[PDB]
Each structure stands twice: as C-alpha cells, then as structure tokens.
Write a protein that binds this ligand. Sequence first.
Ligand SMILES: NC(=O)C1=CN([C@@H]2O[C@H](COP(=O)(O)OP(=O)(O)OC[C@H]3O[C@@H](n4cnc5c(N)ncnc54)[C@H](OP(=O)(O)O)[C@@H]3O)[C@@H](O)[C@H]2O)C=CC1
Ligand SMILES: NC(=O)C1=CN([C@@H]2O[C@H](COP(=O)(O)OP(=O)(O)OC[C@H]3O[C@@H](n4cnc5c(N)ncnc54)[C@H](OP(=O)(O)O)[C@@H]3O)[C@@H](O)[C@H]2O)C=CC1
Ligand SMILES: CN(Cc1cnc2nc(N)nc(N)c2n1)c1ccc(C(=O)N[C@@H](CCC(=O)O)C(=O)O)cc1
Ligand SMILES: CN(Cc1cnc2nc(N)nc(N)c2n1)c1ccc(C(=O)N[C@@H](CCC(=O)O)C(=O)O)cc1
Ligand SMILES: Nc1nc2[nH]cc(Cc3ccc(C(=O)Nc4cc(Cl)ccc4C(=O)O)cc3)c2c(=O)[nH]1
Ligand SMILES: Nc1nc2[nH]cc(Cc3ccc(C(=O)Nc4cc(Cl)ccc4C(=O)O)cc3)c2c(=O)[nH]1
Ligand SMILES: O=c1[nH]c(=O)n([C@H]2C[C@H](O)[C@@H](COP(=O)(O)O)O2)cc1F
Ligand SMILES: O=c1[nH]c(=O)n([C@H]2C[C@H](O)[C@@H](COP(=O)(O)O)O2)cc1F
Lengths: 506, 506
Amino acid sequence: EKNVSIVVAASVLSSGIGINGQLPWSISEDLKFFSKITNNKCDSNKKNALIMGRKTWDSIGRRPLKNRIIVVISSSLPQDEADPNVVVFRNLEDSIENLMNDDSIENIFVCGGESIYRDALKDNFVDRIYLTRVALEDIEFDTYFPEIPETFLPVYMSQTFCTKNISYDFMIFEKQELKSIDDTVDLLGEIFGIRKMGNRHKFPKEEIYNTPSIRFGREHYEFQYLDLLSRVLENGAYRENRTGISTYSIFGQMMRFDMRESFPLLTTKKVAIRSIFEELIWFIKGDTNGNHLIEKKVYIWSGNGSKEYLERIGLGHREENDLGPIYGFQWRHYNGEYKTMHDDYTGVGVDQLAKLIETLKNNPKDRRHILTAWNPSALSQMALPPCHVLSQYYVTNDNCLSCNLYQRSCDLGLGSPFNIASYAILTMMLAQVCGYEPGELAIFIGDAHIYENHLTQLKEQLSRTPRPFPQLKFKRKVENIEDFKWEDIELIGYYPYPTIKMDMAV
Amino acid sequence: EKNVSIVVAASVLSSGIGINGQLPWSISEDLKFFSKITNNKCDSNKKNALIMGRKTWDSIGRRPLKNRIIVVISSSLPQDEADPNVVVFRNLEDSIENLMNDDSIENIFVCGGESIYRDALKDNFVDRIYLTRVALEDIEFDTYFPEIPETFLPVYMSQTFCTKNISYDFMIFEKQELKSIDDTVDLLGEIFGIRKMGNRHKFPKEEIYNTPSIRFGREHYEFQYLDLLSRVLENGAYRENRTGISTYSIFGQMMRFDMRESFPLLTTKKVAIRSIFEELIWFIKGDTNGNHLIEKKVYIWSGNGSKEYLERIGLGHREENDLGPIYGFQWRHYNGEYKTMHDDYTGVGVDQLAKLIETLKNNPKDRRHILTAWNPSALSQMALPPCHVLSQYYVTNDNCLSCNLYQRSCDLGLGSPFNIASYAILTMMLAQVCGYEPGELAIFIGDAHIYENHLTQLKEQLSRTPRPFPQLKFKRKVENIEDFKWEDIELIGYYPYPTIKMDMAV
Ligand SMILES: NC(=O)C1=CN([C@@H]2O[C@H](COP(=O)(O)OP(=O)(O)OC[C@H]3O[C@@H](n4cnc5c(N)ncnc54)[C@H](OP(=O)(O)O)[C@@H]3O)[C@@H](O)[C@H]2O)C=CC1
Ligand SMILES: NC(=O)C1=CN([C@@H]2O[C@H](COP(=O)(O)OP(=O)(O)OC[C@H]3O[C@@H](n4cnc5c(N)ncnc54)[C@H](OP(=O)(O)O)[C@@H]3O)[C@@H](O)[C@H]2O)C=CC1
Ligand SMILES: CN(Cc1cnc2nc(N)nc(N)c2n1)c1ccc(C(=O)N[C@@H](CCC(=O)O)C(=O)O)cc1
Ligand SMILES: CN(Cc1cnc2nc(N)nc(N)c2n1)c1ccc(C(=O)N[C@@H](CCC(=O)O)C(=O)O)cc1
Ligand SMILES: Nc1nc2[nH]cc(Cc3ccc(C(=O)Nc4cc(Cl)ccc4C(=O)O)cc3)c2c(=O)[nH]1
Ligand SMILES: Nc1nc2[nH]cc(Cc3ccc(C(=O)Nc4cc(Cl)ccc4C(=O)O)cc3)c2c(=O)[nH]1
Ligand SMILES: O=c1[nH]c(=O)n([C@H]2C[C@H](O)[C@@H](COP(=O)(O)O)O2)cc1F
Ligand SMILES: O=c1[nH]c(=O)n([C@H]2C[C@H](O)[C@@H](COP(=O)(O)O)O2)cc1F
C-alpha cells in the first residue's frame, strides 16, 4: 500500500490537455515540474513508476525517462522484457501490480491519457492530484482531463507564473477519508475577554472562508483580498458613517501582490479594467474635470460630483462635475491655488509625479520616493478627501520597481478591487518610463469595511475558487507617462467569474 | 503512562513564588488560569491529581479543590481515608503511584512548593511546565522556583496582561527529549528562482531567529519587532545610502502592538524612555529648536543639526541645531512659511493636532483622523525629511483609540524602538485628552533596514528571550495635551536586558 498520484496540466475553464496527439501549449517550467515531482522519492534503492496510455507513450517518442520506470497500458503493444525501464500491461487494474508486490517501486504516478485518467478516477485508484492550470481557452482541444470528483478537496494553490505571456499555477487535491498550546490559548481567551488581542482578531469561520480546505497552501495572492473580506465578516464592528449605509469595519490591515509573474486583477469577479485605466490616466494628466470621465463612458465619479451632492457638502458654488483639487491635482500641482476645473494650471504647485520619475532613475536607492495626496490646506475644497493617501516606491537591486500604498479608508466591495489594479498599472507605467521591471505591491489599510448592502454579493464572491491571475503588457514604449492610451494595454489570459453588481454609497 | 506538568507563578527576574507562607501578589486571572488548566481533562469519568507540599496545603486553608484530587506530600500528616479528595504520601516518588495504577487519574500536576518543584525536576518526573511570569521584583521573597533545566525548551509565550498595574504573561515549556505541500513548494522554488515571490521572502534561519523553539506560540508582541530583524538579516539586500554606512534592506513590512494590557517598550534591550518622551512633547509643542532637547540632556537630534551636516546638505545659512520645518512644525503649522527657529508662528499654518483632537471627540467614527508631515513644499528646508510620514487614528465601538503609522524609512537598530514607544505614548495622550482608552498600534514600513555597524549588536539582542512588557500610566489628567511633563509618567514593571550601544548614521 503506497501512494498513487495523478499529474496533469489542463486548461483553466474546459480542462483541455491535448490536441492532435500533442500538447496545446509549450511551457518549459511545467515539464520541469513534471520531472521533479515524478523523480521525488525517499529510498535511493527504489524507483517511481509512471503509468501512461499508449497514445501518450507515442507522443513522448517511445523513449524512456531517466531514473524512472514507465508503465504503458496497451492491448496490442508487445509485452517486451528487453527494456527494464518500459513495461506493458493490458489494463490499468493489472498494472496496479506495482502495489500488490514489487517493493522496489516506491511511488506510482498516473501520468496521462484521458482514457487512463478517467479509469483511474472511476475505479478510485488515485490518492492525490497534481494539477497545472493553464490560462489558455480560445484554442482547439480534443482531449480533456475529467472533472475532479467530489471526494477530492484542494489543499494548495500556488501563485501565478508566466511563460511566454501564458499564466499558470499549481494545485494539489487530496481524497478525503500540539493541542497543549491551542488549549492554553483557548483557556486564556475564556479568562480574558476582549482584553486578549487575539479575541479581537478571531480567525474567520469556515462558512465565510474562501475554499476552506486550503489551510496551509493559500499562496495565490488573490487570497490576500478574499481573506481580508473574511476577516471583516468575522470581526467587523457595525458602524455608521457619513453615508446612509452602515458598514462592518476593522482597522489596520494589509495585502501583498506579486507583479513580476502576473497582474493582480481579481478573478473571482469580472473587474472593469477599462474604467480603472481611464481613471488612472485621468489622475496622471492632472485632470479634475469629471465630465472627461463621463465622456469616456466612465461613471465612477458621478455620485460624488452631482449638483445635489456638491450643494450638500457646501460646494454649491461649484460647477456640476468640478470635483476640486483631488487626486491628480495634488499629484501635479501640490499646494497650487485651485480655482475651477477650466483654468490653466501649467507651472503652479509642485509636480510630484515629474519629480518622482526623475529621482527614480537618477537616485534609485533613495529612500524618499514618495507621492502624497493628503493636503490639509485643500481638504475643504475637495468633493471627497483622498482615500489612497500616500504611496512610496522602491528600486530593488535587480532593477524592479515595488510600490507601497497607505489607504485611509477602503470600500472592499467596490473601491478595493479598483485600487489594487490601479496602483499595479501605475507602478508598471513608472517602471517602463524609468527603465525597470514591475516588482511587488503592498497595500496598507486604515478603515477596511464592507457596506451592508454588499453582504449578499461579497458572500457570493467568497464561494468562488480563484483562478490564476492574467497578464498585462504594454504594446509600445511611450516617451512620456501621459501618453499611455487604452489601446496600448493588452490583457492576456483573463477568465474571471461573472460580474457582481454592487451599488456605491454616496 | 500519563502526563506530569508543573504549574507555577514566579517573578520575572528572581523567580520568587512566596513570602511568609503566602503569595507575594494577588492576581485573580492567574488563579483562574490555575483552575482551568488543572481541571482540563478528556474523560468525564476521570479526575486530575494535584501534588503539593504540606506548607502549600496549609496556605490554601487545608480545603479541597472542586472536581480534583489533592495529593499532599508530608512526613507527619495522618494518612486519612475519610476525605476521598485529599490523600497523603510520605515522599514524591511514592505519590507517582498515580501512574502505576488508578485509571481514574488522567493527568498529574505538580502544583507548588519549592521543595516539591525542586525534587520533581531533579528526579526528572516533569514533562511540561506552565509558567506565569510576574513583573514584580523589588519586593521580599523567601521561596523560589528552581531554574528550568536545559532539557526544557519554551514553546509558547502569550501577550502581556495587566492586573492592578502588574504585568504578567504565560509560558509553556516542554522537555524536548503534510509533507506533500512542503515538497511541492520546495520543488517550485528550485524551478523558479527569485521569480517565485516566496523565495524573496525566505523564512529566517534558526541561527538568526529569536527563541527558535517557540514555533507556533509567538504571541508576545515583542516578536513583531524581533522577527522583523530576522527577516531583514535573512533577505536584506546590501544597499548604499546618503550616509557612508550601507544597510541590509527590505521593502514593505508591518508590526502590530497591543496597548490595552501593556506598553510596547522593548525588553530585550533597555530603551531610553525619557529621551522618547522629551522628543515627543517637543513635537507636540511645535518646536524645531534642537537646543531645547540638548538642554534637557537629549542628544538624538544633534547629528542632523550640526554646522558640518547643515552646510553639507546646503543649509549652511542656518544656525547650529536649527532643524527647519520638521515634525511638530507640520503638526502645528502645516504649510506655514518657515524663517528661523526664533520667530513667532502662533496662528500660521494649519494646526493638524488641534483639529485632530476636536474631530476625535466630536466625530469619533469619522474615517479621516489623519496627521501628516510630508509637505513637498518644505522638504528642501528640512534638516531631514520625515521618517514617520503619516498617522491615522480610529475610535472603536468600545471607546478605544487605535493608531496606524506609515514609516517610509526605518532604522531598526535605533529609530524603530523609539518610533514604537513614541506613537504609543502619543496615542495614550490623545486617548486621555479625548476621553478614551488606548487601543492598538500598527506600524507599516517602507524601507526597513539594518545598518551594517549594528549587525553584532542586533544579533546580541536576538539572543535574549523577551520578558513581559511594562505598564505606562499617567499620574494626572491634563487640561491640554501640551501640559504633559516627564514627572506625569509612571513606568511600572520594566525589567529589561542591559543597554546595547549603537552609533547613529549621520
Ligand atoms: N496536458 C497533459 O498533462 C497530458 C496530455 N496528454 C495528451 O493527451 C493526448 C493523449 O491522450 P489519449 O487520447 O486519451 O490517449 P491515451 O494516452 O489515454 O492512450 C490510449 C491508449 O491506451 C490504451 N488503453 C487505454 N485504456 C485501455 C484499457 N481499458 N485496456 C487496454 N488498453 C487501454 C489503448 O492503447 P491500444 O490502442 O494500444 O490498445 C489506448 O488506445 C495527447 O494529445 C497527449 O499529448 C497526455 C498526457 C498528459
Ligand atoms: N507562586 C506559586 O505558584 C506557588 C507559591 N507557593 C508558595 O511557596 C511557599 C511554600 O513552599 P515551600 O516553603 O517550599 O513549602 P512546601 O509547599 O514545599 O511544603 C513543604 C513540606 O512538604 C513536605 N515535604 C517536602 N519534601 C518532602 C520529602 N522529600 N519527604 C517528605 N515530606 C516532604 C514537608 O512537610 P512535613 O514538614 O510535614 O514533613 C515539607 O515541610 C508558600 O509561601 C507558598 O505561598 C506555593 C505554591 C505555589
Ligand atoms: C507528453 N507528455 C505528457 C505530459 C506533458 N506535460 C505534463 N504536464 C503536467 N503538469 N503533468 C503531466 N502529467 C504532463 N504530462 C510528456 C512530455 C514530456 C515529458 C518529459 O520530457 N519529461 C522529462 C522532462 C524534461 C525537462 O526537464 O524538461 C522528465 O525528465 O521527466 C514527459 C511527458
Ligand atoms: C496558594 N496556592 C498555590 C498557587 C497559587 N497560585 C498559583 N499560580 C500558578 N500560575 N500556578 C500555581 N501552581 C499556583 N499555585 C493556591 C491558591 C488558590 C488556589 C485556588 O483557589 N484554586 C481555585 C480557583 C479559584 C478561582 O477561580 O479564582 C480552583 O478551583 O482551582 C489554588 C492554589
Ligand atoms: N464609497 C465610495 N465612494 C467612492 N467615491 C469614488 C469612488 C471610486 C469608485 C466609484 C465607483 C466604482 C464602481 O462602481 N465600480 C464598478 C464595480 C463593479 Cl463590481 C462593476 C462595475 C463598476 C464600474 O463603475 O464600471 C469604483 C470606484 C468610490 C468608492 O469606490 N466607494
Ligand atoms: N539614521 C538616523 N537618523 C536619525 N535622525 C534622527 C533620528 C532619531 C533618533 C536618533 C538617535 C537615537 C539614539 O541614538 N537613541 C539611543 C539608542 C540607544 Cl540603544 C541608547 C540610547 C539612545 C539615546 O540617544 O538616548 C534615536 C532616535 C535618527 C535615527 O534613528 N537614525
Ligand atoms: O479609491 C477609493 N477607495 C475607497 O475605498 N473609497 C471609499 C472608502 C469609503 O467607503 C468611501 C468614503 O470615504 P470616507 O467616508 O472615509 O471619506 O470611499 C473611495 C475611493 F475613491
Ligand atoms: O524617527 C526616525 N526613524 C528612523 O527610522 N530614522 C532613520 C531611517 C533612516 O535609516 C535614516 C535616514 O532616513 P533617510 O536617509 O531615508 O532620509 O533615519 C530616522 C528617524 F528620525
């Protein structure tokens, strides 16, 4: 009785694994994973057995794999004994003679063939599944990996990797069958109530935890966002705010996202990437005219720019969509005297963005690459004080650009998915203009909250297992950061779950 | 063969446990801990046995403990059989007859008496040690808990708790006498190099990890600082900076500290608490004259305010120790035009601190309690740009005041211990003035680094197991936050390791 594992690489939506006798992709790192996972063993005087169908045996050229024994399932192949590295069996059950005897075989791997995969799962021979999810869907397949039966549960999901602009990750599924420290912490939590800080940061219950069977392998960085939702649902205090809609709120949180091997665009929900880009280039250009976004069919700033809202907050003198000195006016004209959105501000104020770009490439190891929007002198004139308040940038020794952001207030349902993608694009833009590669993104949050009219929606999103992040590439090298257009951006391999409608609190 | 555990409460330095036949303190929560840990059992048809010396039996009034069986070690007590809840043995070894039979005894606890403790450890009867460390030292003891033998290793250390201004924590010692996920992550780290983000955040090696035997019980929040040192030693990139002293640096980190039950003043090193307060009240008053700190024998700002340094950074026109508009000038006079440190600035600029105090008590649930010091218009005039750049404050539903801080650059050897205690005091001051209690402290860091001339010192500090945090209380209620004096502060129960000298990089 030894272990039997499936190794397979399948597409993210339809589970395609083959086409015309070969693979529908060419990913070198995935073959290295197959090699390392099938060679891994404890006893040096034993070998691992790789079971595969005859058509897969043809596709690998009918040549042996070093250090391993290949088991071919075939009805017509001659049961040859000349090659000790290749053995032939007439059916899959008989090949499980690797179990019944042969103590020189340590582990068994079901290595390919839809027919072999389907029979191994149908007869309940498989203990573990190593799955490489490939983000390629609008191509032709003729061979599929069968649906994983309900007896299996995921226990690991890696970060997203990139090869030739193709996104992929690695997952492990398993077939389902000291206390002294945990007891002491429980007893201390009964004695001290909320006096014990751990009781103020309770671990989320299973019913609000995304894919709960993945306990020690939540490596995919979309869990950084999903688990923050779970923490708010678990520990969030019911609080009122300036809007009529109350929230559940906690204070002091963070999220990390990689940007070297993928782009952090959420997959558990279709995110309006075009509106995100249009808002960001609107910031970069220094613009505060809300009509320019509406003219581009972007209405995210409509609520905080209506005549009724502006009059209510004491800005009735202002034009309809004149939002005042907000993001993009502090970026390009910090401390500049604001009049209206139609005036000419060329030369007024401190151009933070221009100075940031120059210091990033003239003094990369400088510890002061800072862009701020919190101006106490201008807060009263803003339609809304800045939420993403301050950001810092860092040039690594291997010429990557990382970004930290402090956010004072985080609408997790609507604002947060935008903020993650927004500063990811901005860091990539700064990276290209300064001649670096994208690095890492960290977001530090003050008031992280969920509006109570988003509870049904966000619990729906928490029921969806994440998929690998897509890739985002620029189609050309711009001469100035203001020259970026929506046509220059290419989003590769984005296969999200359907859209989830959520209303904005004015 | 069942478990034998010691339960004891001893003072943090000298391990005193008794005086004149009674305890040297009165801590209710510790008695409840003793009750819960000695009653904890699995089988409802079994009981736990509590072994104690005769003098301890006298000190508890010679009355039984509910649901448990007391085993008294005595040479003269009559071996009575009337009470089935109290049994008498003539020596400690014979009383371990609880093991040899009596299947109604599930667990065994050695519950007190220096004579009983010393014999239980000397004869190697003990498997586990439950230790309550009490921060009371300059009092009289006549009974001591023996030194824990080297066969034991700590596995848990709780946060600091407070009873009647007495600090204490709980520790567990043990006599130290699936792999599929870990293997897959290792294999993925061999294929992808620094392309896998986990390889850029490697777990610290044991030789640079403070108290490595505590793996799953690093609850004491001083580990938030110590483990950040370890992360920098493990993954820090060697980088140059404006000073002549290079650092090892990482980007994007955080630390959390409780403030309800203790004050986060590091114990692995004696911290100059008076210099911290004197600098903070210097900020609150709006002062930028460096001589006022030197006149109070505080020299932390001397290096960045000397004639040689000021001339070197292009501020040769300034008087000696005229630091310019820095912390406390942006706090009280944001955007105010700075001339020299001798001028009258009453009324100029935005008084952020005054507006913060007013909003904290008139609109507590407001999500904009923000204090910033990053002024792009004034950076060129500063002797040093702000390190602690922005802070946000939060009023919980149970009337506690929490604080978030973003720090762009963190000297972990010298600056970081100061920043932790500084913003803890400030949040406590704001809490008293606004009528709240202290909450939690979170510090988010950009460039966290260690200067290379601090490596020997910080590795020395990493060899010291932390002690419970002290308490900090105010002796009077001030009418204005500016009225706080050093005499108003009481530091209770601070027993740190000796001072560690480290030079500042100019
Ligand atoms: N992405 C991935 O991870 C992988 C993809 N692939 C791809 O999948 C395709 C191949 O898979 P597939 O089309 O299903 O072919 P198979 O690899 O499953 O091979 C099928 C052959 O196996 C033999 N066989 C299967 N079942 C039995 C049985 N019950 N009794 C006796 N013999 C049996 C038969 O050989 P015979 O006719 O001689 O009797 C059959 O023709 C290729 O394109 C390949 O590249 C393959 C492996 C992995
Ligand atoms: N902080 C804490 O966790 C605890 C503190 N304490 C404190 O410690 C003090 C008491 O401890 P301590 O002074 O050491 O007294 P003990 O509790 O250890 O009791 C001593 C008595 O136990 C009997 N005894 C001990 N060893 C032997 C032996 N080898 N053979 C036979 N009998 C033995 C003797 O009784 P006899 O003379 O009858 O023969 C001896 O006088 C008190 O002040 C108490 O408050 C006590 C428990 C816990
Ligand atoms: C057609 N085929 C089946 C195949 C292909 N990709 C997969 N990918 C995954 N993730 N899992 C599988 N079971 C899998 N199977 C192949 C193709 C190549 C090799 C192969 O060359 N393996 C070498 C790998 C050489 C390398 O280092 O690049 C080895 O040493 O194992 C094996 C099976
Ligand atoms: C004098 N003495 C010895 C004593 C006191 N404090 C300790 N504290 C610790 N952490 N460990 C010990 N072994 C210990 N022993 C005592 C004192 C009171 C009780 C006691 O009353 N226990 C009650 C609890 C009373 C309550 O809940 O407060 C129980 O039911 O266990 C036991 C032992
Ligand atoms: N409380 C609060 N006030 C805000 N003021 C300004 C913002 C910024 C802001 C405002 C609205 C939206 C928004 O609807 N996004 C969308 C979400 C989904 Cl799920 C689908 C489509 C859109 C879309 O619009 O294409 C995103 C950001 C904002 C915010 O996010 N929250
Ligand atoms: N690189 C850099 N520049 C700085 N400018 C301004 C600061 C702020 C700053 C400056 C100096 C010290 C400092 O010596 N603390 C001490 C440390 C120990 Cl271990 C013992 C005594 C003292 C003491 O002095 O009583 C603490 C903070 C600071 C800093 O910490 N690092
Ligand atoms: O980029 C944004 N991110 C964000 O989270 N909000 C939300 C946070 C909060 O729910 C709401 C109001 O901010 P506040 O009430 O704190 O002034 O705006 C708004 C943005 F524009
Ligand atoms: O409160 C402080 N905290 C701190 O960490 N530094 C250190 C950080 C850095 O090592 C040094 C210089 O900052 P920088 O060269 O990035 O401008 O000051 C200085 C302070 F005053």
